[PDB]
Assembly symmetry: D2
Homo-oligomer: 397 residues x 4
């Protein structure tokens, strides 16, 4: 039977994977090889000019990595997947495959910082200009389009304060103007959002976060039409970034994603409990979490995502000093820059990852002095709340 016919949890577990044909090994073998041998010169000829359209494997189409690419293609309802060395490489491989000197991109502003740096500094040095807009306002996207515009690029929910972007509406705008829509689905993952089903042409993830979920792989994935993915593979990866994923990283991500459904359900149930606790706490001025009724785009999130995700941002009373105290007083949450792990991770951007960026530039970038971002893990939510309550109380008494 066909992977695409099963329910979503069944696809999470099975899609792209079968017992090994030669051995019956249930786990996908780790094909940790750099080379593939041919049985004759004919085979060498055919299936190295053919470009992987029988079943012939190559280091750009490793059997292990193939399984992961097919899985994620199924979960996202795209035709084909392409794994990469990092979430950044998924984004740059995509964009550098699509764009040449003289092209233009319209991008959301409220995006992952390293993406913002690639788009603001790197792209224009290759002759590709980018306009940044507030993608929460689809009209700003339309107004930025140019005859040169090849692609519109968005993240949702948006990186710091988890404001949302209306994918369906933006896809319509981009397509009417003949651009592709590229959506970074990292923070939702397949489970919570499916951009392609909403009109996006290409979805990218950092698997580093939820898809792997175990805090032990850096990796990225791109999903879209075969025609695009073929180019992203045989030109973008092969020729431009060289950002191939190692078969071991693919194997671990395959293993991590087996639990995607139940981890996302746990992260989301936990985050909701925690968000409600924070919403009720007199030392917290604001809580940003799509799952709360006070979310300005609550209606959109309802239409567009199946769960409200495991990330919460919130502002502590007392600004910068309160933020540093709270962060230094947590005992269970771990201070880190990543997200989407099994452990609960916390960060204070204005206290840590943005100390150089003067008061003007960080607040502008959505980062207030009292802003804390919380990646909710799989611990007992009452342990996480107790830890937060203890740290907040210390920071604000």
């Amino acid at each position: 039977s066909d992977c695409r016919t099963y329910g979503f949890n069944t696809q999470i577990v099975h899609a792209g994977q079968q017992p090994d044909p030669s051995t019956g090994a249930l786990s996908t073998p780790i094909f940790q090889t750099s080379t593939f041998v041919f049985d004759s010169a004919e085979q060498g000829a055919a299936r190295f000019a053919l470009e992987e359209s029988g079943y012939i494997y190559t280091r750009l189409g490793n059997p292990t990595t193939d399984a992961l690419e097919k899985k994620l293609a199924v979960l996202e309802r795209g035709e084909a997947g392409l794994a990469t060395a990092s979430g950044i490489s998924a984004i740059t491989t995509t964009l550098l495959t699509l764009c040449q000197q003289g092209d233009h991109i319209v991008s959301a502003s409220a995006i992952y910082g390293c993406t913002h740096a690639f788009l603001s500094h790197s792209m224009p040095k290759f002759g590709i200009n980018v306009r940044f807009v507030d993608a929460g306002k689809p009209e700003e996207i339309r107004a930025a389009m140019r005859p040169e515009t090849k692609v519109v690029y968005i993240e949702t929910p948006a990186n710091p304060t988890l404001s949302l972007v209306d994918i369906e509406t933006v896809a319509g705008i981009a397509h009417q103007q003949g651009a592709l829509l590229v959506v970074d689905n990292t923070f939702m993952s397949p489970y919570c959002q499916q951009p392609l089903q909403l009109g996006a042409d290409i979805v990218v993830h950092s698997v580093t976060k939820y898809i792997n979920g175990h805090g032990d792989v850096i990796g990225g994935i791109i999903v879209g039409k075969q025609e695009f993915i073929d180019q992203a593979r045989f030109v973008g990866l092969k020729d431009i970034t060289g950002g191939c994923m190692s078969p071991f990283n693919a194997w671990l991500t395959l293993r991590g994603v087996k639990t995607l459904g139940i981890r996302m359900e746990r992260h989301c149930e936990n985050a909701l409990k925690i968000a409600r606790f924070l919403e009720g706490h007199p030392s917290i001025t604001r809580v940003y979490y799509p799952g709360l009724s006070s979310h300005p785009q609550y209606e959109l999130g309802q239409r567009q995502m199946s769960l409200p995700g495991g990330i919460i941002s919130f502002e502590i009373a007392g600004g910068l000093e309160a933020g540093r105290r709270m962060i230094n007083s947590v005992e269970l949450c771990l201070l880190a820059v990543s997200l989407g792990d099994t452990e609960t991770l916390i960060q204070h951007p204005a206290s840590m990852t943005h100390s150089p960026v003067a008061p003007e530039e960080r607040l502008k970038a959505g980062i207030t002095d009292g802003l804390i971002r919380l990646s909710v893990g799989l611990e007992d939510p009452e342990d996480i709340i107790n830890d937060l309550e203890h740290a907040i109380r210390k920071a604000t008494f």
Copy 2:
């Protein structure tokens, strides 16, 4: 004591590595993590604005990968190393870090095909033009330089027929014109050639070949000045290609390189025996191997490399059909596109990896119909010669 003071085999084994400080583990631990935790907000602040200048680790400076980068910096006598997802990513990360729209590159013609494709097709689409020259003639390099020329790029020995490039001379030319020299040292490796010691500014490898040597890692490494490597890391990798090496791939390459000295000695001793056998064989029209006295640049190879390498190319009598017969009649050598493995690998480019490319374009590219490339492995050389003798005899009777 200092790694840089030991003999070369001692450096191969020890450089960049120490027993783990907390445990005494002799093997470098595999730090297969995506995230690093901070002990406080201060630490988060300092050592994430500081940019890894105490000992703080980050996913761009993973402890495992650090060890490999330091090892290869020592072996190449460079200041700093930077690992990458692939040999192609080492080359593109380097060049895209150095070059912007309006820049120019002078490159050798006789280089790895995927490098040639990145340079001929990808670079000009980002506004960076490339002139290809015969680098065996340092005068062609000088004549191609322009006011826009940022870097001269060479491979040696050159890819198909193992003609050589005079690094010292080319470095002088490039520097007099204010360009950097980038040398791809893949085929020699640290052990056989040290471009930086000859005036190159940056060396790149595919570790996929000899440095790893085990046919089970795709990876790349870049070595050069700290100032350059810092940019290649914190801008090229972080912002442009995202071509990070996974800590497991770094660990395996660390383990592979432990035997670099004795594998290179074995490959080179074996290849010399095999090259001499082929040179004496009436069905072989030509043998290309720097270790033979009939090599046109024999004197240069003597000055520039400590051993003549493990790759041999040779032409079989009877052109295309003889090539396909020989290749189909080998029983021990394996048909494959890679090189630098423990096993002996053979390929017929005109029979396999170049079937589309009409008779005009392949011969031009140094590939004759009867050209066979042999990566000599660690088997008994008489077994390899017996296998070759048997296949040649079949192909040419």
Copy 3:
């Protein structure tokens, strides 16, 4: 704070693990080493006569494997843990550590077949005799005890038909007679049952099943008093079986167990749905599942386990031929001998794993001709039920 104070899900995620002290790496490093180096002869002297009572690491106390042993000690509420090469090695290392020529063991009959073979054939050849009893009847255990009896050994739920053993009662019997109680907790795992909290002295698992849960590790773990575990480590493992777990297998099991809580909840919710479907199906004569009200020991299971587990056994109408037809007609469930994986696995013991064992001996051993055992995975339960309904219908029409 102390791992032992957190809620159980928090312990699953955190117990035995901390960010790496030297690097802040969040994932436990894989210490894939065979050797540990000393800083001086004094250190060599002390901490190799001391026997690992500071923090000194050794190949029997690998840092990675230590983390897994401590985790499982916490989850089981034992003092100390000891990992091993396999679930069988956890059982034999334990028993061979405790027992010498002239000793006796009382064992449950309804246990894992390879355990039964070690106990029935191997133990008596070393002078250690074993009496097998129906442990569902604690009186049979008491009646088998002898002055030589060192240990009572039970599995629960019992292997084929998931009948239960009253741990608390049996522990009391064993201790009154001065024997230790060893419980194999494989099928429940920490999450569903905690034998030590019920009076067992030692718990063993095959981590191959639920604790790892990903179908890609063979491994075992033993938990008990430090005094016992010290002997099981420094004598049983070091001297007798040599059944050390590799640090990589420990790392993967650590990673697998992070999701134990949410996998057990999913397996158990799924199995209950499936068990209810099977209980309502006219082609299924019997369903064995502790979670059904018709379980003869329903009351005991209520007292003794927090969830009713993910394994179901059931009998199909039409005996042997119906069993083979059903098994050959499933399309999503996979035919396999293991259990406790993310995928749903099915087996027909009388059709497969017991074809030699004549009709007399298998039925006696609780295996009827129509008995099917189902390991329920993480797929959508309606997909599993649809698959079963389809196969049953084919097998019984």
Copy 4:
């Protein structure tokens, strides 16, 4: 063609390995699985009663581990191989498979300490008695034989001072009395000694040392007749020790052994240079190294081994205090208990690993106060000699 026909280096590289049939992957895939699936109930029936005599794989006959077992069977010229969790498990699995209550073993005295402990303490508690003899005197072996004697067990070279055992002679003695000869070949490895070719029935190794050679695997291997290995697998491993090797450890050992020939050649060339230096040094009273003409059994070593190995033992002037000073003054050699690594490792047994064992018992056991054991690695031998010269000079001035 047949693996068994090639030269030895060719066998090292190729034996037991082929490109993956389904993919052409050159590296043996890591089959890191616990479970194997069947295609039907028939297959389940046949090839789980059949016991792995078609090509059916099982966790006791993992495809990866199979490759390693076949390789080592070829290198040792035995019929079949069996991998295990540790070198100790190779020895105990073997002996516990062969021996039952009332049996007897004649064993060499000068053997690995943990082997000595298993034989002296563990075996007699299972009703199996052991007589220890000086195996350098084959007459002591004959004189210890009894009607109960099932197996003679030897190591050579012998553990501390590298005295030799005449395998051919001892095999003849054992067989005339109807016992099996088991030889621990760890210190020589396939490359330097082949006991089966000399009349031994079974060879065991710790692969932890030379066969793996990289200081990152603990593992063992047993080679002998199919009939024996079948029992050691399906009874010893499956039923008794459970000491299965993980497929990843097998994969790494496969990768390590690819370089066995060239590592052994390097270790042996280095050790000879170092041994000659030590033999000429006035602060070293004695040097034990089979490669020196002053070795009492020099003639035997000539007949019995192809190279004299990479281990050296030697006595420093000034006894215990000189030993501790020397060891504390080395800067390149690493203090460790293992051997057979790429790095040079040094130990002072009387200073470290034998501090409890009073002056009477250690000297008796061949360990003098001034005895140092050196595992010579792959560094430049002049760096190792310089390091030794520096440490000796400090220790003895």
